[PDB]
Design a protein around this motif. Structure first.
Motif, PDB file in Angstrom:
ATOM      1  N   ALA A   1      12.693  27.449   1.247  1.00 59.56           N
ATOM      2  CA  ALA A   1      11.516  27.076   1.006  1.00 59.56           C
ATOM      3  C   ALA A   1      10.955  25.882   1.743  1.00 59.56           C
ATOM      4  O   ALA A   1      10.050  25.291   1.286  1.00 59.56           O
ATOM      5  CB  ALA A   1      11.693  26.709  -0.585  1.00 59.56           C
ATOM      6  N   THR A   2      11.705  25.702   2.780  1.00 60.44           N
ATOM      7  CA  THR A   2      11.131  24.601   3.830  1.00 60.44           C
ATOM      8  C   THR A   2       9.671  24.842   4.093  1.00 60.44           C
ATOM      9  O   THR A   2       9.277  25.947   4.636  1.00 60.44           O
ATOM     10  CB  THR A   2      12.111  24.441   4.720  1.00 60.44           C
ATOM     11  OG1 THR A   2      13.338  24.742   4.084  1.00 60.44           O
ATOM     12  CG2 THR A   2      12.392  23.068   5.141  1.00 60.44           C
ATOM     13  N   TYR A   3       8.906  23.858   4.450  1.00 53.23           N
ATOM     14  CA  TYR A   3       7.528  24.108   5.030  1.00 53.23           C
ATOM     15  C   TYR A   3       7.472  23.731   6.251  1.00 53.23           C
ATOM     16  O   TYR A   3       8.900  23.648   7.069  1.00 53.23           O
ATOM     17  CB  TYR A   3       6.759  22.943   4.079  1.00 53.23           C
ATOM     18  CG  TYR A   3       7.103  22.962   2.535  1.00 53.23           C
ATOM     19  CD1 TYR A   3       7.385  24.098   2.079  1.00 53.23           C
ATOM     20  CD2 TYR A   3       6.380  22.228   1.770  1.00 53.23           C
ATOM     21  CE1 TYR A   3       7.551  24.335   0.516  1.00 53.23           C
ATOM     22  CE2 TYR A   3       6.567  22.126   0.288  1.00 53.23           C
ATOM     23  CZ  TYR A   3       7.209  23.113  -0.099  1.00 53.23           C
ATOM     24  OH  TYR A   3       7.379  23.398  -1.558  1.00 53.23           O
ATOM     25  N   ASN A   4       6.257  23.520   6.829  1.00 51.64           N
ATOM     26  CA  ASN A   4       6.049  23.046   8.193  1.00 51.64           C
ATOM     27  C   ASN A   4       4.884  22.143   8.258  1.00 51.64           C
ATOM     28  O   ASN A   4       3.952  22.551   7.884  1.00 51.64           O
ATOM     29  CB  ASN A   4       6.179  24.091   9.081  1.00 51.64           C
ATOM     30  CG  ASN A   4       7.673  24.981   9.482  1.00 51.64           C
ATOM     31  OD1 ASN A   4       7.899  24.968  10.452  1.00 51.64           O
ATOM     32  ND2 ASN A   4       8.070  25.644   8.498  1.00 51.64           N
ATOM     33  N   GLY A   5       4.784  21.317   9.233  1.00 56.73           N
ATOM     34  CA  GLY A   5       3.804  20.515   9.502  1.00 56.73           C
ATOM     35  C   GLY A   5       3.974  19.663  10.851  1.00 56.73           C
ATOM     36  O   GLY A   5       4.333  20.154  11.815  1.00 56.73           O
ATOM     37  N   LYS A   6       3.403  18.434  10.546  1.00 53.70           N
ATOM     38  CA  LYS A   6       3.735  17.446  11.647  1.00 53.70           C
ATOM     39  C   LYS A   6       4.241  15.987  11.084  1.00 53.70           C
ATOM     40  O   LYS A   6       3.604  15.671   9.899  1.00 53.70           O
ATOM     41  CB  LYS A   6       2.218  17.480  12.474  1.00 53.70           C
ATOM     42  CG  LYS A   6       2.100  18.849  12.983  1.00 53.70           C
ATOM     43  CD  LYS A   6       0.756  18.937  13.887  1.00 53.70           C
ATOM     44  CE  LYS A   6       0.421  20.341  14.368  1.00 53.70           C
ATOM     45  NZ  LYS A   6       0.165  20.539  15.742  1.00 53.70           N
ATOM     46  N   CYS A   7       4.423  15.441  11.957  1.00 56.76           N
ATOM     47  CA  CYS A   7       4.750  13.606  11.416  1.00 56.76           C
ATOM     48  C   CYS A   7       4.315  12.856  12.818  1.00 56.76           C
ATOM     49  O   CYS A   7       4.247  13.315  14.027  1.00 56.76           O
ATOM     50  CB  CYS A   7       6.497  13.829  11.593  1.00 56.76           C
ATOM     51  SG  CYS A   7       7.501  14.248  12.730  1.00 56.76           S
ATOM     52  N   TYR A   8       4.134  11.651  12.565  1.00 55.86           N
ATOM     53  CA  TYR A   8       3.605  10.582  13.487  1.00 55.86           C
ATOM     54  C   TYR A   8       4.794   9.392  13.515  1.00 55.86           C
ATOM     55  O   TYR A   8       5.203   8.899  12.614  1.00 55.86           O
ATOM     56  CB  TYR A   8       2.453  10.037  12.870  1.00 55.86           C
ATOM     57  CG  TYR A   8       1.475  11.140  12.367  1.00 55.86           C
ATOM     58  CD1 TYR A   8       1.264  12.348  12.896  1.00 55.86           C
ATOM     59  CD2 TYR A   8       0.079  10.691  11.622  1.00 55.86           C
ATOM     60  CE1 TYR A   8       0.360  13.234  12.821  1.00 55.86           C
ATOM     61  CE2 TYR A   8      -0.973  11.799  11.583  1.00 55.86           C
ATOM     62  CZ  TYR A   8      -0.815  12.877  12.031  1.00 55.86           C
ATOM     63  OH  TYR A   8      -1.648  13.805  11.763  1.00 55.86           O
ATOM     64  N   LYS A   9       4.952   9.285  14.616  1.00 59.37           N
ATOM     65  CA  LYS A   9       5.857   7.962  15.087  1.00 59.37           C
ATOM     66  C   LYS A   9       5.291   6.678  14.709  1.00 59.37           C
ATOM     67  O   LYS A   9       6.069   5.801  13.986  1.00 59.37           O
ATOM     68  CB  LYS A   9       6.364   8.313  16.658  1.00 59.37           C
ATOM     69  CG  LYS A   9       5.234   7.860  17.396  1.00 59.37           C
ATOM     70  CD  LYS A   9       5.069   6.610  17.844  1.00 59.37           C
ATOM     71  CE  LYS A   9       5.832   6.186  19.077  1.00 59.37           C
ATOM     72  NZ  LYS A   9       4.965   5.423  19.967  1.00 59.37           N
ATOM     73  N   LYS A  10       3.953   6.425  15.300  1.00 63.59           N
ATOM     74  CA  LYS A  10       3.499   5.280  14.932  1.00 63.59           C
ATOM     75  C   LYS A  10       3.395   5.027  13.407  1.00 63.59           C
ATOM     76  O   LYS A  10       3.418   4.013  13.090  1.00 63.59           O
ATOM     77  CB  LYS A  10       2.018   5.444  15.422  1.00 63.59           C
ATOM     78  CG  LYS A  10       1.469   3.727  16.201  1.00 63.59           C
ATOM     79  CD  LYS A  10       0.140   3.816  16.013  1.00 63.59           C
ATOM     80  CE  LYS A  10      -0.935   4.615  17.080  1.00 63.59           C
ATOM     81  NZ  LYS A  10      -2.205   4.375  16.577  1.00 63.59           N
TER      82      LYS A  10
END
Length: 51
Positions: free
Chosen positions: A1-10
């Motif tokens: 049921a894992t999703y997907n997106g994006k992450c920010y380092k800053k």
């Protein structure tokens, strides 16, 4: 049921559209984000932020 997106380092966070739009940004717990946009999944088994 894992999703997907994006992450920010800053911002060292994981942003993604919850399965119901409920969830949202989620600090990049452990192994900070590599680079803004870095794809990541939201494990619906613990609540981490695979980044």
């Amino acid at each position: 049921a894992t999703y997907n997106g994006k992450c920010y380092k800053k911002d060292n966070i994981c942003k993604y559209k919850a399965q119901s739009g409920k969830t949202a940004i989620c600090k990049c717990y452990v192994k900070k984000c590599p680079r803004d946009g870095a794809k990541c999944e939201f494990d619906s088994y613990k609540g981490k932020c695979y980044c």
